[PDB]
């Protein structure tokens, strides 16, 4: 859920240098992908604000988040709307990859 997504971005900022993993310790580059470009991010990080605006119910069941709920979340994070819709699509592909492996 979104409470877990923020924790992953929060732990990335906590333990991440030069987008490590990606040879952060040598530091030259260094971006692990290459790359970088960051790769993420000055906007993926905001990702934290969108999940923060959600309720406890909305976080536990993201399938309940529709038009009237989205419009409320966007106004509380000062977003729109395409940036939040991007974060949720990325999270959907993550759980598909998590259940398939470990």
């Amino acid at each position: 859920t979104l409470d877990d997504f923020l924790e992953q971005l929060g732990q990335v900022r906590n333990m991440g240098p030069l987008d490590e993993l990606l040879q952060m310790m040598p530091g030259a580059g260094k971006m692990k992908g290459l790359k970088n470009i960051q790769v993420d991010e000055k906007q993926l990080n905001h990702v934290e604000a969108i999940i923060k605006s959600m309720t406890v119910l909305e976080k536990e069941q993201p399938d309940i988040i529709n038009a009237s709920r989205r419009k409320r979340i966007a106004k509380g994070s000062g977003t729109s709307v395409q940036e939040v819709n991007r974060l949720l699509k990325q999270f959907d592909e993550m759980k598909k990859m998590m259940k398939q492996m470990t």
């Binding site: 990335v12 993993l21 960051q38 993420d40 990325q90 993550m94 990859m97 470990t102």
Partner: peptide, 22 residues
């Protein structure tokens, strides 16, 4: 095992931040 799980989670978060096509 727990440590491994944590690492995996972190990786997933990083990927999300990067963004990528479906």
């Amino acid at each position: 095992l727990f440590l491994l799980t944590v690492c995996t989670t972190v990786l997933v978060s990083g990927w999300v931040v990067l963004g990528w096509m479906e």
